[PDB]
Scaffold this motif. Structure first.
Motif, short mmCIF file in Angstrom:
data_model
loop_
_atom_site.label_atom_id
_atom_site.label_comp_id
_atom_site.label_asym_id
_atom_site.label_seq_id
_atom_site.Cartn_x
_atom_site.Cartn_y
_atom_site.Cartn_z
N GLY A 40 3.08 -1.98 3.92
CA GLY A 40 2.47 -1.04 4.86
C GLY A 40 2.92 0.42 4.75
O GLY A 40 2.63 1.23 5.64
N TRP A 121 19.72 -5.29 5.28
CA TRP A 121 19.06 -4.35 4.37
C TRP A 121 19.48 -2.88 4.58
O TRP A 121 19.84 -2.47 5.69
CB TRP A 121 17.53 -4.53 4.30
N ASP A 224 0.09 -6.05 6.18
CA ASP A 224 1.34 -5.29 6.30
C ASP A 224 2.58 -6.17 6.49
O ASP A 224 2.86 -6.62 7.60
CB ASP A 224 1.20 -4.30 7.46
#
Ligand code: 0K9
Length: 375
Positions: A40, A121, A224
């Motif tokens: 996305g 992350w 997305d």
């Protein structure tokens, strides 16, 4: 390392609701970072300075192959944002193809509500098209660089699996047939910016919503992986919620449950799955007046959170339909950029139900499908 598809199977991880990430390396010597997979957006960006939520970050000074582009950048997502400094460096995907490429990297120096405490992350890989890249469309996205510099075919596929830890696969450069069952069904990419598609019909427990199909795509519909929920335009959302409410009316829910602000809980293992309807999204097909449908189970749109507790994972939108991660889970999704189409098949890691199954089914006949696109 051969870059064979088996090497990429199970290369994604995540914490529940915090996004799917893939291991990447940046620089020379290689610096390892975990990177959010986002269909996305179109910017590749990594933390490049200390942050309370980062356990590691890109250290440009330690990379001999780093090149400054002497240009700043910021990206505003729906709530989160970051700003940083543009550069290029060498990038590899350890559990990906056996290649190294030089790619644009935005080095994040400051951010607001972007990084998540404990997500594991440190960056984002925007896999959509240059048209939506920041600061402008001359900033070549990572996947465009990959295809241009190597012989990796211009396609990737995503198998997002459920559960709390989550996992899955990003097959870069192809389709791994061990990851799905039945036939792949394809919908055209309407425009190369977001991965934009056209929904032509919506059914809830086999009953047509009977809305003007333009409403389903107002003002766009996209696929997305960086959005969690199924997001629906106001009018469609209201119709869907009315229908789901009525289907499940034998149960008692708080008002803010349907808004996503409250949890509903049941005695462990007594969740009344049968009272929540299946949702069928019909997508424009590859041939004239032809469509196919994907069927969503309630296990997809009631997202488990920590008795069994769930959030309602359908939310109202004023920015169009978003087929988020909860929709993608239990399907094998092929982003066939080469043939400007997105493929769907039942995933090998399909979401279970006692008596119902998530499905990808066709062909269906649907007249005037072009009228469904918003202009
Ligand atoms: C949190 O999810 C919200 C909806 C989100 O903004 N997700 C991000 C990617 C992202 C960024 C930061 C964190 C996350 C995640 N948090 C938890 C799980 S994933 C995900 C995703 O890129 C959203 N895609 C579309 C989704 C839409 C809604 C229709 C288009 O809104 C967007 N607005 C701005 C952008 C950035 C651009 C391309 C304009 C520079 C993108 C989008």
């Amino acid at each position: 390392k051969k870059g064979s598809f088996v090497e990429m199977v199970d290369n994604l991880r995540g914490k529940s609701g915090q996004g799917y990430y893939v291991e990447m390396t940046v620089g020379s010597p290689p610096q390892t970072l975990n990177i959010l997979v986002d269909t996305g957006s179109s910017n590749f960006a990594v933390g490049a300075a200390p942050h309370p939520f980062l356990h590691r970050y890109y250290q440009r000074q330690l990379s001999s192959t780093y090149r400054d582009l002497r240009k700043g950048v910021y990206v505003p997502y729906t709530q989160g944002k970051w700003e940083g400094e543009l550069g290029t460096d060498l990038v590899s995907i350890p559990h990906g193809p056996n290649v190294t490429v030089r790619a644009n990297i935005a080095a994040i120096t400051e951010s607001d509500k972007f990084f998540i405490n404990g997500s594991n992350w440190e960056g984002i890989l925007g896999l959509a098209y240059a048209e939506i890249a920041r600061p402008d469309d001359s900033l070549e996205p990572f996947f465009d660089s990959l295809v241009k510099q190597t012989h990796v075919p211009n396609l990737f596929s995503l198998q997002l699996c459920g559960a709390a830890s989550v996992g899955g696969s990003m097959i870069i450069g192809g389709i791994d047939h061990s990851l799905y069952t039945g036939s792949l069904w394809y919908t055209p990419i309407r425009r190369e910016w977001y991965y934009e598609v056209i929904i032509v019909r919506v059914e809830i427990n086999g009953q047509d919503l009977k809305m003007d199909c333009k409403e389903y795509n107002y003002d766009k519909s996209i696929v997305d992986s960086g959005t969690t929920n199924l997001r629906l335009p106001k009018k469609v959302f209201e119709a869907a919620v009315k229908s789901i409410k009525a289907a499940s009316s034998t149960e008692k829910f708080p008002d803010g449950f349907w808004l996503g602000e409250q949890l509903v809980c049941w005695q462990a293992g007594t969740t009344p799955w049968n009272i929540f309807p299946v949702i069928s999204l019909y997508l424009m097909g590859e041939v004239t007046n032809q469509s196919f449908r994907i069927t969503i189970l309630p296990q997809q749109y009631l997202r488990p959170v920590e008795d069994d507790c769930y959030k309602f994972a359908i939310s109202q939108s004023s920015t169009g339909t978003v087929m988020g991660a909860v929709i993608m889970e239990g399907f094998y999704v092929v982003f066939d950029r080469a043939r400007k189409r997105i493929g769907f098949a039942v995933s090998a890691c399909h979401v279970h139900d006692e008596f119902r199954t998530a499905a990808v089914e066709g062909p269906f006949v649907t007249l005037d499908m072009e009228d469904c696109g918003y202009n």
